[PDB]
Amino acid sequence: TVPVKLKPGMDGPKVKQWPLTEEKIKALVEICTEMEKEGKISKIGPENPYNTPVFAIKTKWRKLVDFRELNKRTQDFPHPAGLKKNKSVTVLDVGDAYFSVPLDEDFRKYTAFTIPSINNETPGIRYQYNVLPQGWKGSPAIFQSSMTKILEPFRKQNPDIVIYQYMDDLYVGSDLEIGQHRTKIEELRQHLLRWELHPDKWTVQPIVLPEKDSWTVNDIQKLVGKLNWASQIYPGIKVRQLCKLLRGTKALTEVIPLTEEAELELAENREILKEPVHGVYYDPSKDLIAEIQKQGQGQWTYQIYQEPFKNLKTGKYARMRGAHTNDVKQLTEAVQKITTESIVIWGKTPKFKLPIQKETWETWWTEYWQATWIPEWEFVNTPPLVKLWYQLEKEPIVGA
Amino acid sequence: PISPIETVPVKLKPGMDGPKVKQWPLTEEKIKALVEICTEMEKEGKISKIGPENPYNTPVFAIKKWRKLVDFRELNKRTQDFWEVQLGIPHPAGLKKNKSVTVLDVGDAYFSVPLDEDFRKYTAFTIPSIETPGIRYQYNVLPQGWKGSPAIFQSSMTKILEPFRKQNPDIVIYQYMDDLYVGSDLEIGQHRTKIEELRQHLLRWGLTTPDKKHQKEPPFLWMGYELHPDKWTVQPIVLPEKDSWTVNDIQKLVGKLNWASQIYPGIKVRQLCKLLRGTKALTEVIPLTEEAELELAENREILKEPVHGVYYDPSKDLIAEIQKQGQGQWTYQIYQEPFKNLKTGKYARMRGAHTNDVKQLTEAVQKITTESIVIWGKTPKFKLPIQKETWETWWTEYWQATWIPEWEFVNTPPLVKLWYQLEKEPIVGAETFYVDGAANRETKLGKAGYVTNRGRQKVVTLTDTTNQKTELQAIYLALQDSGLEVNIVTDSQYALGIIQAQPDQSESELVNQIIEQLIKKEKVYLAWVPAH
Ligand SMILES: Cc1cc(S(N)(O)O)ccc1NC(=O)COc1ccc(Cl)cc1C(=O)c1cc(F)cc(C(F)(F)F)c1
């Protein structure tokens, strides 16, 4: 085993376990006993003060540990820009690989986790890892030499296919037709068994200003307000001529004929929004940020950026079948999608700005989480304009 | 007797050292009592007579025959941290009904467990003299009052318990501080035998169980409740009768009464709380008002109510009904079968900066949901005083992500509804007030008013005001002077928020007035436009 340590001055994580459903507790209990036997983990005393949240996801349960805090405190240790171009990418869960590898003995105490007992009837069961834990930053790292080795063949055999490893995940991307792609994957899983994304289509949609037979005082008002704000992203947007028609105290419903200057002004603005603001470039030294707005009726808008108004990417996510009566479900779904694209494109997860109440999210997000990694997040209060603005994003002619 | 169980490796906090606290000098009458108590422990193997080698020391005292008290506050400051000793406490509403239960006070099981030999030296203390060298000792077992003792004990029990636990699944043991709560549904004969079996097993590890004398018997007092076999009750709540009430008394009283509002229906403390206004001292005597006297009266009577509940039958549904007692005040009860509650509650009015009832409704739903999961590990089926069409109309459009687990409508007034819904579009044929308000934020002098499309106008002069207040006031006037249908334009940023969240309650009296007004209109359209 190689000696791993925490960043200088960093102490072990002591994150409190959130309550879990009986169903989930039973599951973890079963899962952990089995691991205990296989010597993957061991019960621990109270002398170990650390702890990390744990839970179960998905028809059987998979154990998911929340190592965000530990990953952060773990000492530090490349991205293939070609992945983002590939026609299709399939993701694979390779966390099982780790269990074989032993975790340095002196570091194990920091992986300590707790299984909760319903109605505090019994103190929870304490465990710590002996082997590489899935979800920990160090695991994919430590098990790197080993991963290359097992990948070399397939890679060298197919230099046309790009493979990228993120945490427990492996993103394999090629250009073959759908069938020939899925075939190459199995050839890989088989290769691994012995030890559906599409980037080229992720098109950047533009902001689209309304167009009306006739405009009303209101129509302009709402319009001028949005253009004004948007002025922060495109300095060339002008509302002068538009604000002139808005002179006086007419009824909000009265129709205003447009001057030709206003018509041109509107035209220049439409042309400016035709494309994404210039000079936006990704910076590795800076964190990625993803903001989500609830547009409502299953529609959501997001923008990935590092500097305000300098979007690296923006998009729309429509809820998925069988998620209607659940806001939280849609949101977690979208968070996972966006995080995925984020990894695919930059090889890292963005910190999230979620339009939801801390308590609301922390009570139900795990119920629909399906990735092995967990992004960072913070809760916010959507500024009405930001919402109105991206609500203006263009959509397919008929669809797709 | 001590236990033949492995010790847990204890360490002192990072780099710090063992305590060197001077021994508080005592009287010959106390030294004698300690010397004795210590000789008894010494023979029990709990403490070891030691030499000068030890540079550490903790103060020992004498309280009441006499009882010894060692002050480890210092050692505790220098002792490593442990996994928090179960912080959440067991709630009666979460107890499955067992046919039989037995309490086993593994009391001084603290002294029952050995101390990591490596660590014992830091526990050294000294029995003074009548000037001459005192008698030195050190603990060979978990000390009473020491930081890690509770944690270690609990764990020790745990190991010891693993076997039996594993051998008798149809049985349940609840670990809590000094006691073990053991229940089952076998036959009283069989149960009793297991108890005796467990008991016996414990002694097998130097851990000895109670005496027919200390054995506690139902009902059981759990956090103010009384635990009866087939149901639970509340220990009687006593409201002292006096002719002289001090501040302290009233607060104390309000305290006890607040807790009671959880279990008892109808408890009120408004008038009593009023008494605290401008109080200058705790010992200050505040004469009860007439209303205060009555309130207190009616409450004395409500506490004469035999409030009771049932236990947890997992094989049965879990239901939670909610009511809106007042604006921001919510009451709820969780029962499996009608009228047989397991637990009930009320959430103190929340004073947000701005929000609405449907929102507050989900918040109640969410605190309850989290509660349930801790108590039962499941989430209840909700009976909420709100229509499905209402819920649907609000949630689908609200800027924030929200949700309510499976629920159903229960028509039990008052019902929670949307007090108003701003128009999606400008209203045709409705006046259009262009409102606006400005004010020297420094001189706090300002004006506000409007100018409708129909030519109507106004401006009001205001002193001691802020720009926000003027703007909102501009909106308020518009609302006043308008008809049941009105369009309002405003460059107010705070109005933008209203359009988004359409709050029906806030912290500003102003907003409040506006809301009242909004509520009263038949149709309102609020449009925002940038300033200048
Ligand atoms: C109160 C009672 C007496 C009898 S009996 N043996 O007839 O006297 C049988 C069942 C019950 N009660 C029940 O059915 C439900 O209660 C229980 C069901 C199972 C178990 Cl093991 C304990 C209780 C308790 O009453 C209880 C009492 C306490 F002081 C503290 C605690 C706790 F562990 F949570 F801290 C639990």
For residues B36 and B136, state if they share a domain: yes
Determine the distance in angstroms separating the CA of B1 from the nearest CA of chain A, rounded to an integer.
Answer: 23
> How many residues appear in chain B?
532
For residues A86 and A107, state if they share a domain: no
Check if A2 contacts B (Cβ < 8 Å). no
Residues with CB under 6 A from ligand 1: B 90, 95, 97-98, 100-101, 172, 174, 176, 181-183, 218, 220, 222, 227-229, 311
Q: How far is CA A71 from CA A10, A68, A107, B343, in A?
A: 11, 5, 13, 41
Q: Give the single-character DSSP code of B148.
A: T
For residues A179 and A211, state if they share a domain: no
For residues B56 and B94, state if they share a domain: no
Q: How far is CA B160 from CA B153, B175, B437, in A?
A: 11, 12, 74
Contact A361 B174 (CB under 8 A): no
Count of the separate structural domains present in chain A: 4
Looking at A154, A171, A201, the residue that finishes a domain is: A201
Nearest to A364 among B81, B89, B403 (CB): B403
Q: Which of residues 267-296 of A touch B (CB under 8 A)?
A: 293-294, 296
For residues B381 and B409, state if they share a domain: yes
Give dist(CA B504, CA B499) in Å, integer. 12
**B9 contacts in A (CB within 8 Å)?**
45, 47
Longest CA pairwise span in chain A (Å) = 81
Give dist(CA A99, CA B357) in Å, integer. 50
Q: Residue A170 domain-assigned?
A: yes
What are the backbone dihedrals phi and psi of residue A153, each rounded to the nearest 5 degrees, phi first? Answer: -40, -75
For residues B118 and B224, state if they share a domain: no
Residue in the structure block whose two tokens are 């001590």: B2
For residues A73 and A43, state if they share a domain: yes
Per-residue burial over A271-286, b if 16 or more Cβ lie within 10 Å, else e, is: ebbeebeeeeeeeeee
- The token pair at A51 is 């702890």
Q: Binding site annotation covers A93?
A: yes
Give dist(CA A327, CA A333) in Å, integer. 10
Instruction: Give yes or no for a contact between B528 and B490, defined as CB atoms under 8 angstroms apart.
Output: yes
Contact A119 B95 (CB under 8 A): yes
Where are the alpha helices (H) located in B423-487, listed in sequence order?
Answer: 467-481
CATH classification at residue A103: 3.10.10.10
Looking at B273, B290, B312, the residue that finishes a domain is: B312
Q: Residue A400 domain-assigned?
A: no
For residues B380 and B434, state if they share a domain: no
Q: What residues contact residue B523 under an 8 Å CB cut-off, 6+ apart?
A: B423, B427, B430, B484, B485, B486
Rg (alpha carbons) of chain B, rounded to whole number: 33
- The token pair at A283 is 């910076």
Segment holding B272, helix H or strand E: helix B270-274
Find, in chain A, the residue whose alpha carbon is nearest to that of B159.
A45
- The token pair at B420 is 């108003």
For residues A197 and A233, state if they share a domain: no
CATH classification at residue B142: 3.10.10.10
Check if A363 contacts B (Cβ < 8 Å). yes
Calculate how far, in angstroms, residue B98's C-alpha sits from the geometric centre of ligand 1: 7
For residues B210 and B103, state if they share a domain: yes
Contact A121 B90 (CB under 8 A): yes
Nearest alpha carbon to residue B408 among B438, B433, B377, B387: B387
CATH classification at residue A145: 3.30.70.270
For residues A160 and A262, state if they share a domain: no
For residues B253 and B278, state if they share a domain: yes
CATH classification at residue B430: 3.30.420.10
A388: number of Cβ within 10 Å: 20
Reported resolution, Å: 3.1
Determine the distance in angstroms separating the CA of A354 from the nearest CA of chain B, rounded to an integer.
Answer: 9
- The token pair at B211 is 């005496």
3-state secondary structure of B130: coil
Give dist(CA A123, CA B165) in Å, integer. 14
Instruction: Give yes or no for a contact between A17 and A26, defined as CB atoms under 8 angstroms apart.
Output: no
Contact A253 B426 (CB under 8 A): yes
Chain A interface mutation, best of B175, B362, B373, B422, highest count of A Cβ atoms under 10 Å: B373
Looking at A230, A263, A282, the residue that finishes a domain is: A282
Residue nearest to ligand 1 atom 19, measured at CA? B183
Check if A242 contacts B (Cβ < 8 Å). no
For residues A272 and A307, state if they share a domain: no
For residues B439 and B391, state if they share a domain: no
Domain span holding position A154: 82-98+140-201
Q: Residue A383 domain-assigned?
A: yes
Q: Residue A238 domain-assigned?
A: yes
Nearest alpha carbon to residue B237 among B309, B293, B296: B296
Instruction: Give yes or no for a contact between A184 and A97, defined as CB atoms under 8 angstroms apart.
Output: no
**A210 burial level (CB within 10 Å; 0-12, 13-18, 19+):** exposed
Check if A109 contacts B (Cβ < 8 Å). no
Per-residue burial over B5-18, b if 16 or more Cβ lie within 10 Å, else e, is: bebbebebeeeeeb
Q: Residue A182 domain-assigned?
A: yes
Q: Residue A397 domain-assigned?
A: no
For residues B95 and B200, state if they share a domain: yes
Looking at B247, B281, B312, the residue that finishes a domain is: B312
Chain A interface mutation, best of B5, B8, B10, B83, highest count of A Cβ atoms under 10 Å: B83
For residues B261 and B278, state if they share a domain: yes
Instruction: Give yes or no for a contact between A107 and A75, defined as CB atoms under 8 angstroms apart.
Output: no
Give dist(CA A47, CA B81) in Å, integer. 7
For residues A11 and A39, state if they share a domain: yes
Instruction: Give yes or no for a contact between A71 and A154, defined as CB atoms under 8 angstroms apart.
Output: no
For residues B12 and B95, state if they share a domain: no
For residues B209 and B320, state if they share a domain: no
Q: What residues contact residue B337 under an 8 Å CB cut-off, 6+ apart?
A: B310, B316
Calculate how far, in angstroms, residue B173's C-alpha sits from the geometric centre of ligand 1: 10
What atom of ligand 1 comes closest to residue B101's alpha carbon?
Answer: 6
Contact B377 A120 (CB under 8 A): no
Q: Binding site annotation covers B105?
A: yes
- End-to-end, the C-alpha distance of chain A in Å comes to 51
Chain A interface mutation, best of B13, B177, B529, highest count of A Cβ atoms under 10 Å: B529
Q: What is the 3-state secondary structure (H, E, C) of chain A?
A: CCCCCECCCCCCCECCCCCCCHHHHHHHHHHHHHHHHCCCEEECCCCCCCEECEEEECCCCEEEECCHHHHHHECCCCCCCCHHHCCEEEEEECCHHHHHCECCCCCHHHHCEEECCHHHCCCCEEEEECECCCCCCHHHHHCCHHHHHHHHHHHHHCCCCEEEEECCEEEEEECCCHHHHHHHHHHHHHHHCCCCECHHHCCCCCECCCCCCCEEHHHHHHHHHHHHHHCCCCCCCCCHHHHHHCCCCCCCCCEECCCHHHHHHHHHHHHHCCCCCCCCCCCCCCCCEEEEEEEECCEEEEEEEEECCEEEEEEEEECCCCCCCCHHHHHHHHHHHHHHHHHHHHCCCCEEEECECHHHHHHHHHHHCCCCCCCEEEECCCCHHHHHHHCCECCCCCCC
Find, in chain A, the residue whose alpha carbon is nearest to that of B495.
A384
Give dist(CA A270, CA B158) in Å, integer. 71
**A354 contacts in B (CB within 8 Å)?**
401
**A363 contacts in B (CB within 8 Å)?**
366, 369-370
Calculate how far, in angstroms, residue B227's C-alpha sits from the geometric centre of ligand 1: 7
What atom of ligand 1 comes closest to residue B181's alpha carbon?
Answer: 21
Contact A120 B398 (CB under 8 A): no
Count of the separate structural domains present in chain B: 5
**Cis preceding-peptide flag for B4 (omega within 30 of 0):** no
CATH classification at residue B168: 3.30.70.270
For residues A206 and A242, state if they share a domain: yes
For residues A123 and A164, state if they share a domain: no
Domain span holding position B64: 1-85+111-149
Q: Residue A256 domain-assigned?
A: yes
Nearest alpha carbon to residue A68 among A283, A382, A381, A378: A378
For residues A133 and A17, state if they share a domain: yes
Contact A294 B81 (CB under 8 A): no
For residues A252 and A273, state if they share a domain: yes
How was this entry determined?
X-ray
For residues A26 and A133, state if they share a domain: yes
Residue nearest to ligand 1 atom 13, measured at CA? B97
